[PDB]
Amino acid sequence: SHMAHQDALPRLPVPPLQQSLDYYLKALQPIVSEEEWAHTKQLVDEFQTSGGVGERLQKGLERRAKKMENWLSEWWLKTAYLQFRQPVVIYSSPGVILPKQDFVDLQGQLRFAAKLIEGVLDFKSMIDNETLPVEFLGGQPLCMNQYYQILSSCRVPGPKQDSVVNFLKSKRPPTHITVVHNYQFFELDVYHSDGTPLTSDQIFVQLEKIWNSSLQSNKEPVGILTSNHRNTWAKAYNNLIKDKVNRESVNSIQKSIFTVCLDKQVPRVSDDVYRNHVAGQMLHGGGSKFNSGNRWFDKTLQFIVAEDGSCGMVYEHAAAEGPPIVALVDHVMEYTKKPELVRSPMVPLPMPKKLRFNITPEIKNDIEKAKQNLSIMIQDLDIMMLTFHHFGKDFPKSEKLSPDAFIQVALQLAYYRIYGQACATYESASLRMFHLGRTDTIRSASIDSLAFVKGMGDSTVPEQQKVELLRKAVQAHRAYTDRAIRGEAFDRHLLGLKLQAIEDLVSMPDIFMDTSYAIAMHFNLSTSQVPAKTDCVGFFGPVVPDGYGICYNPMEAHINFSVSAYNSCAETNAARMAHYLEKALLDMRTLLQNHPRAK
């Protein structure tokens, strides 16, 4: 946004080598054996010895920070996403379930979709004109770059690694979105010749034409191709665009401001699993016989409007970070509530262009393979949605405790109660205090959290001691969180040192081949907070086979939770985890309320 704002942003720092390594050792203590830790302790000493390996890699990073706007940006984008070859569906792109709407028929479905589209466009005008209010935290400026990467962008498959395209500020910025109904894509202009955007009224009319132009689900679901493994899709994609019309259709989709999915009616399911199924619809589409073919997962922003009133979205992580999504969601959902103005007469509108795909035996075969792969992926995903109604940010705030820290500690307690030990845990920290900053790691399994979880279930530890361990664990998490936001965390730094060595063509440092590092980076618990004003929540699959994916949005008086796991791992169970988490949150509240400070 504002040039002066961005120019005043500090550059991402390179923490002192001794600092990060000391923090690293501290974070390893609760998750590795005494034997593995003592060894890592030795490797760390060797790594930072004067004139040693680590010393040179550090200087390498320091030279890097001097020459680039952000020393970590490209590396992070490349290693975390562009080089990740698993399908983006479930394993990378987060899904979000929004408040269910009240429409009961197709007309209502199109009307809402029309309103949503207008809302996103309204948000876009602020981004285009850079009038989007600049943001701060604790009095310090926050980078606004993330906002200029979510619209008019798309991920592009590559044989070895993928890439991202962004046309928001190209010579001739896109003025159309893409609409997909019954697996058929349409190019819809949402701006009149004079630059003004179409009204919800005008949009509805265009959506009506699109719906009518694709009444049956009688076309191959080419879109489902985007849900396959990245190496597989890269090849199928190359073949797909050999045809001129296909290439043109793909191009229109890639350049579209965003995509809106008008989903088809799905079978009824028992009430107790309804939310779980809707989450599924937003994350992956539910399957080849449902709405998965009504998607283009390479697209950065996909808004989904279900037939039964439900709605949500799925965003591609390479190009989109959490903050901009939250802002867009809160803005759009409010816009959909603002009083619509009196209907001004309507002018003629063109027919939205259908983006056809010429099917061949090769493309058809690729589609069938994609259906099979996605069916396997979905069958292995175990999702449990939990609406914690007992309390929200209100209780923790009444105890002068950070709600996010409180939740993370509860999760640590729940995990320990089930497995009897702690595990590498990941929570995302925002690095927006720095120019082009994305994320760093907050490690929730710590010396203090382990002390608390153990003491909580130890009959020999007096409740008064248990409550003190609880407050220390929460305060310790809060401190880690604040340090990470200030660039004092160590995970991206250690990654940087490793990448620096790779680039310098030196032998992989021992500290990275260390078993302790492998354990440290294998997150059995991968979490994320969605601090939105809108009553919504996100979800994603676990980052490891034997892990859980836990997302939450703390509201004032309740907390929205999603817990995912893979069935292929017999040791994990989403429902069981959600149950323990609920009880953990409750037991922590009970302990605190019965053992207050002093009068």
106 and 147 Cβ atoms separated by less than 8 Å:
no
Catalytic residue among 181, 277, 317, 331: 317
- According to the annotation, is 23 in a ligand binding site? no
CA separation for the pair 456, 474 (Å, rounded): 14
CA-wise closest residue to 230 among 87, 371, 377: 87
Angstrom distances, CA of residue 118 to CA of 5, 337, 367, 565: 28, 12, 33, 36
Pairing state between β 135-137 and 140-142: antiparallel
- According to the annotation, is 393 in a ligand binding site? yes
- Specify the DSSP class assigned to residue 308: T
- According to the annotation, is 372 in a ligand binding site? no
Q: What secondary structure does DSSP assign to 113-173, as a single string?
A: HHHHHHHHHHHHHHHHTT-SPPEEETTEEE--GGGGSSSSEEEE--SSS-EEEE-TTSSS-
- Specify the DSSP class assigned to residue 563: E
CB proximity list for 101: less than 8 A, separation 6 or greater: 108, 112, 309, 310, 311
- According to the annotation, is 62 in a ligand binding site? no
- According to the annotation, is 399 in a ligand binding site? yes
CA atoms within 13 A on the CB side of 460: 1
CA distance between the termini of the chain: 49
H-type alpha helices, 241-319: 244-255, 274-283
In 10 A of CB 266, how many CB atoms?
Answer: 20
Tell me whether residue 73 is exposed, middle or buried, using C-beta atoms within 10 angstroms of its C-beta: 0 to 12, 13 to 18, 19 or more: middle
CA-wise closest residue to 511 among 31, 43, 50: 43
- According to the annotation, is 161 in a ligand binding site? no
CA-wise closest residue to 476 among 440, 439, 449, 442: 449
- According to the annotation, is 397 in a ligand binding site? yes
CA-wise closest residue to 347 among 206, 177, 178: 206
- Specify the DSSP class assigned to residue 77: I
- According to the annotation, is 400 in a ligand binding site? yes
- According to the annotation, is 533 in a ligand binding site? no
Give catalytic status of residue 317 as yes or no.
yes
Radius of gyration, CA atoms only, the chain: 25
- According to the annotation, is 439 in a ligand binding site? yes
AA letter at 238: N
Angstrom distances, CA of residue 187 to CA of 31, 167, 192, 207, 254: 51, 16, 14, 11, 11
CB proximity list for 455: less than 8 A, separation 6 or greater: 461, 465, 466, 469
- Specify the DSSP class assigned to residue 93: B
CA separation for the pair 188, 207 (Å, rounded): 9
- According to the annotation, is 259 in a ligand binding site? no
CA separation for the pair 477, 461 (Å, rounded): 22
Tokens representing 116? 């949503």
Tell me whether residue 40 is exposed, middle or buried, using C-beta atoms within 10 angstroms of its C-beta: 0 to 12, 13 to 18, 19 or more: buried
- According to the annotation, is 402 in a ligand binding site? yes
Tokens representing 480? 């880690």
Residue 259 pairs in a beta bridge with 178, 302
| Residue numbers belonging to the annotated binding site for (R)-carnitine | 426, 428, 439
Residues designated as active site: 317
| Residue numbers belonging to the annotated binding site | 393, 397-404, 426, 428, 430, 439, 478, 529
| Residue numbers belonging to the annotated binding site for CoA | 393, 397-404, 430, 478, 529
